[PDB]
Amino acid sequence: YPMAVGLNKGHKVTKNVSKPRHSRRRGRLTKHTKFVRDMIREVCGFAPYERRAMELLKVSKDKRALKFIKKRVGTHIRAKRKREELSNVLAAMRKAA
Amino acid sequence: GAYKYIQELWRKKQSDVMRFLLRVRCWQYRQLSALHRAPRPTRPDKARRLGYKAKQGYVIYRIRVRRGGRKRPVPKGATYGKPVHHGVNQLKFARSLQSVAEERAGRHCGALRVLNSYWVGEDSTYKFFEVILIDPFHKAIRRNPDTQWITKPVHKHREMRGLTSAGRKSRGLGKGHKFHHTIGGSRRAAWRRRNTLQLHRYR
Amino acid sequence: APSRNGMVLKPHFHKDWQRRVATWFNQPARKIRRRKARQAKARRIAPRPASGPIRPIVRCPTVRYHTKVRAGRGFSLEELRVAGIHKKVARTIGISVDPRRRNKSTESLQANVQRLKEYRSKLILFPRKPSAPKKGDSSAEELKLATQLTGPVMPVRNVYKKEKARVITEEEKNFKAFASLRMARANARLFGIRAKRAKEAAEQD
Amino acid sequence: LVENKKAQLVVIAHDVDPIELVVFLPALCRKMGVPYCIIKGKARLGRLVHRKTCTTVAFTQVNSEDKGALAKLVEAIRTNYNDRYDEIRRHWGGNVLGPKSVARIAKLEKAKAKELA
RNA sequence: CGCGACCUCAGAUCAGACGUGGCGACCCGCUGAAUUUAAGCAUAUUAGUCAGCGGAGGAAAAGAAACUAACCAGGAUUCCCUCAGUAACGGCGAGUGAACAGGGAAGAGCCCAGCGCCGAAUCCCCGCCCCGCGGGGCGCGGGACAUGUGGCGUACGGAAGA
RNA sequence: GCCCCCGGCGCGCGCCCGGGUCUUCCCGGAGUCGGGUUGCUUGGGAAUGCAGCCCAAAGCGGGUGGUAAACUCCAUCUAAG
Ligand SMILES: [Mg+2]
Ligand SMILES: [Mg+2]
Ligand SMILES: [Mg+2]
Ligand SMILES: [Mg+2]
Ligand SMILES: [Mg+2]
Ligand SMILES: [Mg+2]
Ligand SMILES: [Mg+2]
Ligand SMILES: [Mg+2]
Ligand SMILES: [Mg+2]
Ligand SMILES: [Mg+2]
Ligand SMILES: [Mg+2]
Ligand SMILES: [Mg+2]
Ligand SMILES: [Mg+2]
Ligand SMILES: [Mg+2]
Ligand SMILES: [Mg+2]
Ligand SMILES: [Mg+2]
Ligand SMILES: [Mg+2]
Ligand SMILES: [Mg+2]
Numbered sequence: 021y022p023m024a025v026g027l028n029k030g031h032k033v034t035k036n037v038s039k040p041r042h043s044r045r046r047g048r049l050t051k052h053t054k055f056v057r058d059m060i061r062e063v064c065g066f067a068p069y070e071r072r073a074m075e076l077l078k079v080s081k082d083k084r085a086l087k088f089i090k091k092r093v094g095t096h097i098r099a100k101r102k103r104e105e106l107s108n109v110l111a112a113m114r115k116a117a
Numbered sequence: 118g119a120y121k122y123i124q125e126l127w128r129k130k131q132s133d134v135m136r137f138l139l140r141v142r143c144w145q146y147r148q149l150s151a152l153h154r155a156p157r158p159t160r161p162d163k164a165r166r167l168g169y170k171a172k173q174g175y176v177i178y179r180i181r182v183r184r185g186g187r188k189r190p191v192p193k194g195a196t197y198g199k200p201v202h203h204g205v206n207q208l209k210f211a212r213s214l215q216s217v218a219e220e221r222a223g224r225h226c227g228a229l230r231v232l233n234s235y236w237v238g239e240d241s242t243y244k245f246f247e248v249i250l251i252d253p254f255h256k257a258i259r260r261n262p263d264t265q266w267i268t269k270p271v272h273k274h275r276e277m278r279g280l281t282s283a284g285r286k287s288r289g290l291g292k293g294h295k296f297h298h299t300i301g302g303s304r305r306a307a308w309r310r311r312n313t314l315q316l317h318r319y320r
Numbered sequence: 321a322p323s324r325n326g327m328v329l330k331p332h333f334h335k336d337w338q339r340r341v342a343t344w345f346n347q348p349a350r351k352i353r354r355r356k357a358r359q360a361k362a363r364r365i366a367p368r369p370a371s372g373p374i375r376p377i378v379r380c381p382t383v384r385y386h387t388k389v390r391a392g393r394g395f396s397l398e399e400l401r402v403a404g405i406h407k408k409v410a411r412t413i414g415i416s417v418d419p420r421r422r423n424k425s426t427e428s429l430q431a432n433v434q435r436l437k438e439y440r441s442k443l444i445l446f447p448r449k450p451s452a453p454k455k456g457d458s459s460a461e462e463l464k465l466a467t468q469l470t471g472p473v474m475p476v477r478n479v480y481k482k483e484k485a486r487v488i489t490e491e492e493k494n495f496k497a498f499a500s501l502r503m504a505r506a507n508a509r510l511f512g513i514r515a516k517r518a519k520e521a522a523e524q525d
Numbered sequence: 526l527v528e529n530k531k532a533q534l535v536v537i538a539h540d541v542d543p544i545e546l547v548v549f550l551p552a553l554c555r556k557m558g559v560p561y562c563i564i565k566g567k568a569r570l571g572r573l574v575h576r577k578t579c580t581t582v583a584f585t586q587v588n589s590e591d592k593g594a595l596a597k598l599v600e601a602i603r604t605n606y607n608d609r610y611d612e613i614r615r616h617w618g619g620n621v622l623g624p625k626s627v628a629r630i631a632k633l634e635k636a637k638a639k640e641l642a
Numbered sequence: 643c644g645c646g647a648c649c650u651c652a653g654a655u656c657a658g659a660c661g662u663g664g665c666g667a668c669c670c671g672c673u674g675a676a677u678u679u680a681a682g683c684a685u686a687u688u689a690g691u692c693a694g695c696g697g698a699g700g701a702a703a704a705g706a707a708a709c710u711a712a713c714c715a716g717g718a719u720u721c722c723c724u725c726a727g728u729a730a731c732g733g734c735g736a737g738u739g740a741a742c743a744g745g746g747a748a749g750a751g752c753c754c755a756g757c758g759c760c761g762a763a764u765c766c767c768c769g770c771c772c773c774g775c776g777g778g779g780c781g782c783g784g785g786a787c788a789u790g791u792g793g794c795g796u797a798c799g800g801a802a803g804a
Numbered sequence: 805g806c807c808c809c810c811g812g813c814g815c816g817c818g819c820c821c822g823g824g825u826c827u828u829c830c831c832g833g834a835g836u837c838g839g840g841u842u843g844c845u846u847g848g849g850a851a852u853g854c855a856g857c858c859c860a861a862a863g864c865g866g867g868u869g870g871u872a873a874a875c876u877c878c879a880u881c882u883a884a885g
Contacts, residue, residue, distance in 0.1 A: 021496075026504035027511060031714045034426045038398070042800040042831090043882055047865030050831075052757080053121070055528075057863090060125050063552050064132035069860085093861060094839035096874070101862070118528065120756060120791095121832095122549040128834060131860085134548055156650080159543055161790050166755040166833055167885055172792055173766065186843080186856050189673095198675060200684055209843050209855045212672065220671095224696085227661035233885075236835060254660055257766060257787085263753075274697050279671045282885070287671080289853045291883095292709050292718090294870070297741060298846055298853060301720060302703040303670070308690080310721085311740080314341050321681095330737070332727075334679070334688070354747075373749080381715040382743060390744090393717065397799055406823075407799075411750090419799040420707075420717045428714075540649075546790060567790095568648035577648060580790065690845075708837100708867045708883040730847050730870105739847050755885075756832055780817085798882085802830065 066109075070102075074110060077103075123162040143240040146179060152225055155179040158247060159237060167233035167282075168264075169249050174257040176229065176250040178222045179237070182214050184244050215283040218246040219276035226250065230267050231276040234283055362467060367446065369468040373416040374439050375475055376432050391475035394418025395436065399429055403436040413443065438473065527559050532583035534599060535559055538567035541580050550581075555610050560602045 022032060066074070069092040076085045090099035130139060142159075155177040158164035169175055186209040189196070194205040215234055223231040229250040238245040252258060253268040266272070272280075279287050290299055300307045322328075362370050376399070378392030394416040397407065411417055415436070423429040444463050447455045526532040527550075535554055541547060554561040564570070570579035587595050606613070 021500075023501070023504055025501065025508070027508045029508075029713085033424075033714055036424050036426050036429060038423070041881095042798050045798080045800085045831075046882060047863040048831090049863055049865085052830080053832095053863085056121055056125055059552055059556060060122070060129070060549065063126070063548060064129050064134050067129075067131045067860090090839090092839095092859060094837090094859090098838080098861065101865095105862085118758080119546070119549070122553075123545050124756080124834085126545050126549060128861095130835065138544060157790065159790095161543065161546075162755085163834090165791090168754080170754095170792065171788070171790075172764090173787060184856080187673095196675090201686095202675070204843075207843050207856090209857095210672085211844075211854055213855070216671090220696090228659095229661085239835085252660080255766085257792095261765080261792095271699060271702075273699095277671065277697050278669095278703090280703090284671080286884080287854075290704075291853090292707055293868085294710085294741075294848090295852060295868090297848085299704095300741085304690090304846095304853095305670080306703070306720095309340065312335065312337075312340060314337050315722090316341050316343055318344050318347055330727080332738080334737080336688090336691080339691090357748095371749095378716070379714060380744075381711065381713070381717095383713060385744065386713060386715065388744095390716095393749095404824095409823095416749090417751095417799090418717065420709090422716090425714060541790065542649080543790065566647080571789095572647070574789080576789065578790070708881055710880095711869085712879080730849075732847105741847100753885105757830060796831105798831075800831080804828080 070106060073103075074106060077106065077110060120162045120165070123160075127160065127162070139238060140240075143238040143245070146181065146238060146245045147240070147243055149179075152178055152180055152222065155247060158249070160235060160247075163235050164247070164249055167235065167249060168251075169232075172257055174252045174255040176226075176252070178226070178248045178250060180218045180222050180246050180248050182218050182221070182244050182246065184214070184239065184242055186210055212279075212287050213283060214244050215246060216276070216279070216287050218244075219248060219281060219283055222248040222250070223274060223276045227274075228252065228254075230272060230274075231281055232267070233281055365467075367444075367462045367466045368414060369466075369472060371468070371471060372414050373411075374414065374435075374472050375416055376418075376421075377428075377435060377475065379428070389476070389478055391471060392418075392421070394421065395432060396421045396423050396429070398423055399432045400436065402429075402433045403440065405440075413440075413445070415439065435473070442472065526583050526585060527554055527557055530557060530559065532559060532585045533587065534584040534595065534602070535561040536570065536582040536584075537561060537563050538570050538578065538580045539563070539565040540567045541578070546580065551606075551610075551613070555607070558607075560599050560607055562602050562606065 024030065065071075069088070073085055073088055076088060086099050086103050089102045090096055093099060093102055126135065129135065157171070158169060158177050159179075161171075164177070165171075186207065189205050189208055191197075191205065194203075196202055196205065215236075219231050219234050223229065230253050232249045232251050234246050234248045236245075237247055251264070251267050253272075258264055259268060275281055276284060278284070288299065288303060290296060290303075298304055298307065301310065358370065365372075374395075375391035375393065376395045378390045379386050380388055380390050395410075395418065397417070397419055400407075400410055400415070400417070405413070407417060444456045444459050445454065447453075527535065535550070537547065537550055551561060551563075567578040567580060570582055571577050573579075573582070584595065
C-alpha cells in the first residue's frame with residue numbers, strides 16, 4: 021500500500037549500505053597531529069582574550085564568559101566549542117595539581 | 118617533519134613567542150624601500166605550498182602597500198552628479214590590498230611572471246607582502262616539464278588580468294547559488310550574453 | 321499613452337540594445353562546419369565508434385522527471401569495480417568514468433553492471449602484438465561497420481510495464497481510499513506535535 | 526629521527542634568522558627525551574657538511590670507539606639543558622636600556638643616596 | 643692587531659638571456675558618469691554601460707565541485723532551445739530581472755606542498771669529446787644551485803609499506 | 805604531366821613490474837574561513853558576491869541546505885595551492 025506523500029515518503033527502494041567516501045575522513049584528530057598541537061600549546065601559551073576569559077571562567081560567571089567569547093569569535097556555535105576547549109585547559113590546571 | 122610545526126607556530130599568530138617575531142619584522146621592513154629583493158622566502162613553508170621550489174629562477178620581492186580605502190580623485194569633492202554619487206571619502210575599491218601588491222611588483226619587473234603572494238606583516242598604516250616570481254626564460258624552468266606552462270605567453274602578466282589566487286578571490290568566481298553573477302568566464306561575459314538579444318533567422 | 325482595452329506591455333527596450341545583438345546569419349555555415357567537423361572526426365579515429373565512450377543509465381533528479389531515464393555521464397567507480405576492471409584501464413576500453421557518482425540503489429547499481437557485462441560482451445578490440453590476451457580473431461571484417469550511431473547501445477529504450485490483466489478482488493475496492501492520502505498527509509504534519517503533546521502529558525505527573 | 530627516538534644528540538645552530546625553524550625543537554626534545562645542544566655558528570655547522578648553513582645535526586649511529594666519547598658528553602649536556610627545562614622556560618631577556626640612560630639612573634642613585642646620607 | 647667562514651648588502655661598458663612599444667574589431671582586470679524615463683524631482687531608471695586606465699591571444703576567460711538537489715536522485719566548464727518576461731527586486735511606482743532542472747552542440751582529464759621512504763639518488767653552467775645533414779641534442783672532468791630540503795614513487799576517486 | 809612541403813607502415817637510441825585480497829600504520833592548504841560593521845554591487849530578500857576596518861578560528865572539524873536565533877536529526881561537499 022505505497023504512498024506518494026506521508027511519513028513513508030516516495031518509492032520504497034533497496035538501500036546500498038556500503039563503504040563511505042574517503043573525503044569524509046578529513047578533520048579527524050589523527051594521533052600524529054594530536055602531538056603537534058599539544059606540544060605547541062606548551063610552547064606558545066594563549067591569546068589575551070582567552071587568558072582573561074579563564075580569569076572570567078573562575079570567579080565571574082559562566083554566562084558572562086560565553087558572551088565574551090561570542091563577542092570575540094564568530095558564532096554561538098563557536099563560543100560553546102571554545103568554552104569547552106578552554107575548560108579542559110582549566111581542569112588540567114587545578115586537577116593535575 | 119617540521120613543515121607541520123612551522124605551519125602550526127605561524128598559525129597561532131597572537132601568542133607571546135610569535136607576537137615578538139611579528140612586531141620586530143614589522144619594524145624590520147618599514148625602514149627599507151618600497152620594492153626590494155628578499156633573498157629567500159621568510160615563510161619557507163608558505164612559499165613552498167604556493168609553488169616555490171628552492172632553486173634558481175625564483176625571486177622574492179618583499180613588497181609594501183598602504184592601508185585604507187581609496188578617495189575619489191575629484192577636486193574638492195565636487196563630483197558633479199546626482200546625490201548618490203557624492204561618494205568622496207567612503208569608497209573601498211573592489212580589489213584586495215594583496216592584488217595591489219601583485220600589480221606593483223610584476224609591472225616593475227616585466228621580465229618576470231607572478232605566481233602567488235602571501236602575508237608578512239602590518240602595524241598601523243603599511244601592509245607588507247611577499248611576491249613569488251617566475252623567470253620564464255631560465256633553463257631551470259624551460260626544462261622541468263612540471264613548470265613549463267608559465268612560459269607560454271598567455272600567462273604574460275598574470276596578476277593584471279586577475280588570474281592568481283589573489284585574482285580569483287577578486288572577481289568572485291565559484292559554483293552554485295552564491296555565484297550567479299558570473300555565469301560564464303566573468304561578470305562582463307555574464308552581462309554580454311544575459312543581455313544580448315538573440316535576433317534569429319526564423320523568429 | 322495607453323488607450324482602449326489592451327494588455328500592459330513592459331518590454332525591456334530602454335537599454336540600448338542595438339549595440340549588443342547577435343545575429344544568426346552564420347547559422348547555415350556553422351552547421352556545415354560541424355558536419356564536416358564530425359566527419360573529420362569520423363575518418364581520423366579508426367574502427368572505434370564516433371560518440372564512442374559508452375554512457376551509463378541514470379534517472380532524472382526531481383519529482384517531475386524521475387519517471388524517465390537518461391544516459392548519464394560516467395559509470396560509477398563502484399559500479400565499474402563490480403565488473404572488476406581498473407580505472408584508467410577502462411577509459412582505454414572506451415568507457416566513461418565519473419568519480420563523483422554514488423550508488424544508493426542496487427536496482428540501479430546492478431542494472432549498470434548488466435550494461436557493462438553487455439558492453440564487454442559487445443567489445444571487439446585489437447591488440448598491438450597478438451599475444452592473445454583479451455583480443456579478437458578475424459572477426460566479421462571489423463564487425464560489419466566501423467562506427468555506431470548515437471551511443472553504442474541506444475541508451476534511452478525507456479522500459480515499459482505491462483501488468484496486463486487481473487480480476488479485481490475483495491478488500492481492495494473495499495478498503496483503498498482518497499482519504500488514506502489525506503489521513504497520511506495529515507499524519508505527517510502532526511508527527512512533531514503529537515510526539516510532544518503526549519510527551520508533556522507524561523512529563524506533567 | 527627525534528620524533529621516533531632515532532637519534533641521540535642534537536646540535537642546533539645559533540643564527541637561522543627565521544626563528545620559527547627553532548622554537549619547536551627544544552620543547553620537542555624535551556618531550557621525547559633526546560638531549561640537545563644550542564651551539565654557535567650556522568656556518569660552523571656547515572663546515573662539517575660541505576654546505577653554507579646546516580642548522581641541525583643529529584648524531585644517530587655512533588661508532589665502536591665513540592659511544593664512550595658520547596656518554597662523556599651527554600652527561601654534560603643534560604647537566605645544562607635538559608635538567609633545567611623549568612628554568613629555561615622562564616628566561617625573559619632584554620629590557621636592558623642604553624648605557625647613557627643607565628648612567629643617568631646611577632647618578633640618580635648617588636643624589637638619592639645623598640638624601641640617605 | 644691579523645685571517646677565515648656565513649649572512650644581510652651594494653659596484654660594474656662583467657659573461658649570457660629578458661621586459662619595454664604597436665594594432666586594439668572579439669576577450670580579461672579595475673575606474674565609472676550624464677542626457678534620457680518617472681509626464682516635476684533626489685532613491686530607482688540611464689548602467690555597473692560611453693569616455694579614462696592597464697594586460698594578453700588566435701582565441702581569451704572559465705575547469706575537473708567547500709555543486710545542484712530534497713526524490714527511484716544528479717555529477718567539471720563554456721555555448722544554444724526552453725525554464726521566463728518567471729520566483730524575486732522597486733518612491734512595490736516607472737521599471738529591472740536570475741537559476742536548478744529537461745533536450746542539444748562538445749566531451750579529457752590531471753599534478754604539487756604537506757605525510758614519511760630513497761645517503762641530494764636532482765638541477766644549472768663551464769671544460770673536453772661524441773653525432774648525421776637542414777640545426778639542436780646524448781655519453782666523461784670541474785665550478786655552482788641546494789639540507790632555510792632539488793629528485794623518484796604520492797593526491798582525498800584514498801595512498802603507502804610488508 | 806612539372807616543381808615545393810606535410811600528416812598514415814619499418815634497420816638503431818631513451819626507458820619498464822603490473823593486478824587482487826588481507827594485516828599494519830599514513831592522510832592535507834590561516835590574518836585565512838567565520839563574526840562585527842561600513843561602502844559598492846546583485847533578482848538575492850534579517851545583508852548574493854566583492855572590499856576596508858576591527859575582532860579573530862577548529863579538528864566527530866569546516867562551508868552549504870534560499871526569513872533572523874537556539875536545540876537537534878540528516879542530506880551533501882572538502883575551502884583559503
Ligand atoms: Mg638565487
Ligand atoms: Mg514571429
Ligand atoms: Mg491614446
Ligand atoms: Mg539611451
Ligand atoms: Mg517631459
Ligand atoms: Mg547600476
Ligand atoms: Mg571604455
Ligand atoms: Mg603592451
Ligand atoms: Mg599575437
Ligand atoms: Mg579555445
Ligand atoms: Mg585554474
Ligand atoms: Mg511563459
Ligand atoms: Mg540594473
Ligand atoms: Mg542596483
Ligand atoms: Mg565537516
Ligand atoms: Mg563550525
Ligand atoms: Mg537547519
Ligand atoms: Mg577534491
